[PDB]
Design a protein around this ligand. Structure first.
Ligand SMILES: [Mg+2]
Length: 876
RNA sequence: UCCUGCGGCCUCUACUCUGCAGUUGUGGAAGGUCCAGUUUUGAGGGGCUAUUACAAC
RNA sequence: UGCAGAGUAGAGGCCGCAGGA
């Protein structure tokens, strides 16, 4: 057999990249050896596989690791191992349905053997090699089988092209239609992977292109491109052709996979402040909205708009990567633990389902350090031992106990919910991440945060950090936290009085009202009876609203089933610490069951529907905690469908609540399932009991305006701030005064653009020819003045608006109340939307000032860079 | 002096797969919402509210 | 009816690297 001419003519390239291919392979094999604590087919990792089915496996955990990781690092091995199974079934007349270690070993033995051969030939001026002799063992056993394997591999690789790059039949036909002749392999095809290579025995070997393909399985995409570009393997397709790109992509599609910063965060911050906040974008004219839109080269619109407020996560990354806090660490989530409670759980619809329980893996540390701890080399979580399930593992509703517990793979992120930031205060510096311990493979032992801060406090914290330094900032948070702790310890000793409350160093406006009540001698619980009376009335009114709306409308059964499932559980009495009420899976089933319920007045189907509520122990004889009125819904007859069920449910609800109202009116005591007299809400608070809950059970709720006194003392010392009344100056105000007076800066120009609000339309009172209300775009000065005149202007608005209701025929004979109510709600909602929107945009301004300031500080102290000249006003 | 290819970061869109959607307790300094001769200075006042979290099923 | 995670793809911004004329 002759060396292919392509190989002989491009020897320096085949030489170079064959060596690179073999080194890359060894690298993977070496990595796997190290992580698992185990002539490349004699590598320890490959020996292991060779011997793995020599009797009963003594190291199954190692075998399985090797098989899994080999298929990760060598993606082509999934295809080739599958072909090797099918081959062996042929050879030994078997029906093995599953790939095993023998398949994997054989594929890689051959691939490595041929790669080694060509490596040796192409990296030597002259070596007469025995392995090229026609009919020899090497050719018959290794090389010729490999050529057929490679050819079958490529069939599948081209199929993968469709999935991966969206190529169509027409795109790939220049290869797919010409590979095989009529079925033979068309060795005359320009991209043929097999040839006779002047073998007198006339057996198919790897062609030059075939050898290039083998090599490229073991290269990075960068080197695939450098290598193939040197080779005349593209017939007449030119550098810019799609066909050339298809060929190259086909040679990389399943190839080897080889095993944030201060600067990056700074640049993430600057790219945040150039984007439009979403609340602002809504209010802008189409012209100004257009200013945030780009058309790309490929004629695609791309929108520079914030999808969420990333101020706080950006700030947390800034602190973490900067190593700016010695003691404080933020609350991170690192995935979920899933454990199998029961493989066969009978549900309230009488169908059996796997019952899997989840727990979040919450902890405290710097995002990078926590992330390094989360995923061990051996693919377990932290120091737990428990496996992290990978993307390749796809086993839905898996019922096998051996597969549990496992941990969902999720990158460490900060937990940022309910506008809060939770943190843990370490006594010592350079503490390790606080990962949760797992107990009995089932409980995730989490840690109550030290303290919790409003995300609305983060601007002032940032500002304090910028003026004083992160270490002084941190000492203040820690000192505030320790003041609250001293207070709560004194409460537990009953040593807090009106006479000494000031000594604790906490302003009245930052003490819980219950402490203030307790020292003033005015401690009281809420009035449960008042609450019952009010709740019953509110709910009766709502029930009638829903009855009317439904008759009028006659509709999403999904929407109906949401209402019904919530309400059914609301009215279910609790016993035994709430252990009797409907649990998550059964709740999902009940709600879905309702949404799709539609007997054809089929008796069995009706019985089945009723039975569900019997099994949930809501209706039926012998039930101890029944729903108070649901059983009336099924008295006389079962409703035929979800819509009938909703109607009957609401009527029965109305009768129940009317009864309650009537008993309340007689001065009698009533009880509802979901109001519980034994809850602390209803009792008088005690100093000592409340002391302990505040110290031990909850995070410290950090006060607003923690940093104000220190911020204001600093700024008072600056001469540029001389003419500021610090007695009417909040931190939002002072950030902007700092930017203007000390830095000669201002906010981004797009915060001066005119905005639209329905409420301001109503207050402006301007109509078109047809009589519709106009969408104005106002300045802030205009809105200031409309708002001053809102009483008069609201009067005008209502007068006109009411007339326009009675002009329309549907609401023509409408009561004074009906109209007045419709308008009341219209103006309230609009006014509230406008006020909140304007407040939030004013926060976005000063948040952007702070990101800009911090980013600029990072980059100033980096690089061959100077940036004293740069200003937020220039950002667009 | 630019074009082709590769890696990292962040965002958006499409697709697949896998999962979740409940209870009780505690907690209204904080968060949400509503009222006003309140704020364009998440500043302040009054009312209503378990929403983050943690524990247990 | 809604939410979450991972993978892949595509489009885009910024940074870094390689190669050919
Ligand atoms: Mg305050």
């Amino acid at each position: 057999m002759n060396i292919p001419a392509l190989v002989e003519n491009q020897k320096k390239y085949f030489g170079t990249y064959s060596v690179m291919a073999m080194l890359n392979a060894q690298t993977v094999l070496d990595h796997i050896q190290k992580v698992a604590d185990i002539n490349l087919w004699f590598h320890p990792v490959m020996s292991h596989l060779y011997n793995a089915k020599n009797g009963y496996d003594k190291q199954p955990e190692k075998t399985m690791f090797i098989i899994e990781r080999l298929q990760s690092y060598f993606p082509f091995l999934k295809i080739m191992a599958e072909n090797q199974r099918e081959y062996s079934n042929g050879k030994y007349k078997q029906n093995r349905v599953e790939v095993n270690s023998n398949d994997i070993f054989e594929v890689l033995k051959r691939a490595f053997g041929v790669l080694k051969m060509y490596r040796d030939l192409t990296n030597a001026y002259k070596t007469y090699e025995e392995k090229l002799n026609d009919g020899c063992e090497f050719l018959t056993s290794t090389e010729q089988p490999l050529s057929g394997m490679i050819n079958n591999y490529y069939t599948v690789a081209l199929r993968n092209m469709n999935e991966r790059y969206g190529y169509k039949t027409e795109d790939l036909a220049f290869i797919q239609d010409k590979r095989f002749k009529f079925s033979q392999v068309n060795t005359g095809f320009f991209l043929s992977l097999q040839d006779y290579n002047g073998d007198t025995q006339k057996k198919l070997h790897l062609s030059g292109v075939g050898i290039a393909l083998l090599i490229c399985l073991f290269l990075d995409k960068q080197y695939i491109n450098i290598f193939l570009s040197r080779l005349p393997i593209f017939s007449s397709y030119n550098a810019q052709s799609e066909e050339r790109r298809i060929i190259i992509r086909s040679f990389g599609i399943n190839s080897i996979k080889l095993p944030k910063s201060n600067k990056s965060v700074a640049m993430d911050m600057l790219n945040e402040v150039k984007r439009c906040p979403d609340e602002l974008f809504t209010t802008l004219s189409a012209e100004k909205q257009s200013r945030f839109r780009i058309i790309s080269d490929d004629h695609n619109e791309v929108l520079m708009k914030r999808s969420s407020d990333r101020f706080v996560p950006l700030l947390l990354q800034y602190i973490d990567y900067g190593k700016l806090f010695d003691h404080i660490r933020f609350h991170v989530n690192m995935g979920k633990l899933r454990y199998l409670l029961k493989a066969d759980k009978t549900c309230i619809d009488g169908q059996t389902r796997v019952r899997v329980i989840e727990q979040p893996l919450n902890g405290f540390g710097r995002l990078e350090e926590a992330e390094t701890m989360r995923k061990q080399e051996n693919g377990t979580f932290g120091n737990s031992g428990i496996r992290i399930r990978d993307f390749e593992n796809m086993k839905r509703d898996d019922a096998n106990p051996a597969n549990y517990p496992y941990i969902v793979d999720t990158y460490t992120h900060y937990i940022l919910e309910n506008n809060k930031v939770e943190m843990f205060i370490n006594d010592k510096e350079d503490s390790a991440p606080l990962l949760p311990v797992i107990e009995d493979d089932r409980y995730v032992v989490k840690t109550i945060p030290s303290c919790r801060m409003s995300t609305l406090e983060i601007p002032a914290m940032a500002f304090h950090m910028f003026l004083f330094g992160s270490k002084k900032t941190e000492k203040l948070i820690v000192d505030v936290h320790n003041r609250y702790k001293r207070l709560f310890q004194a409460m537990q000793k009953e040593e807090v009085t009106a006479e000494n409350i000031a000594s604790f160093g906490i302003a009245e406006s930052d003490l819980p009202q219950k402490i203030l009540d307790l020292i003033s001698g005015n401690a009281h619980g809420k009035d449960v009876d008042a609450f019952i009376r009010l709740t019953v009335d509110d709910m009766l009114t709502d029930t009638e609203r829903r009855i009317k709306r439904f008759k009028d409308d006659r509709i999403s059964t999904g929407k109906l089933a949401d209402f019904l499932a919530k309400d059914i559980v609301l009215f279910q009495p609790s016993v035994n610490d709430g252990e009797n009420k409907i649990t998550g899976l059964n709740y999902r089933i009940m709600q879905s069951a309702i949404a799709v319920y539609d007997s054809g007045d089929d008796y069995e189907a009706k019985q089945q529907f009723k039975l569900m509520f019997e099994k949930a122990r809501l209706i039926g004889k012998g039930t101890t905690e029944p729903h108070p009125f649901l059983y009336k819904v099924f008295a006389r007859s079962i409703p035929a469908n979800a819509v009938e069920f909703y109607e009957r449910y609401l009527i029965e609800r109305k009768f129940y609540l009317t009864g309650l109202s009537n008993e309340i009116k007689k001065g009698n005591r009533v009880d509802v399932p979901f109001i519980r007299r034994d809850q602390n809400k209803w009792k008088t608070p005690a100093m000592k009991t409340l002391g302990r809950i505040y110290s031990e059970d909850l995070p410290v709720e950090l006060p607003r305006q923690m940093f104000d006194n220190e911020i204001k003392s600093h700024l008072k010392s600056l001469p540029q701030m001389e003419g500021i009344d610090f007695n009417n100056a909040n931190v939002t105000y002072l950030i902007a005064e700092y930017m203007k007076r000390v830095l000669d800066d201002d906010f981004q120009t797009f915060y001066q653009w005119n905005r639209n609000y329905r409420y301001m339309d109503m207050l402006k009172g301007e109509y078109d020819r047809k009589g519709s209300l106009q969408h104005c775009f106002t300045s802030v000065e205009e809105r200031e003045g409309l708002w001053k005149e809102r009483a008069s202007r609201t009067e005008r608005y209502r007068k006109q608006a009411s007339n326009k209701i009675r002009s329309n025929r549907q609401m023509r004979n409408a009561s004074s109340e009906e109209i007045e109510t419709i308008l009341d709600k219209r103006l309230s909602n609009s006014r509230n939307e406008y006020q909140k929107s304007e407040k939030v945009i004013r926060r976005y301004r000063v948040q952007d000032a702070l990101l800009f300031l911090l980013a600029k500080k990072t980059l100033t102290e980096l690089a061959d860079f100077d940036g004293e000249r740069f200003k937020l006003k220039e950002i667009m």
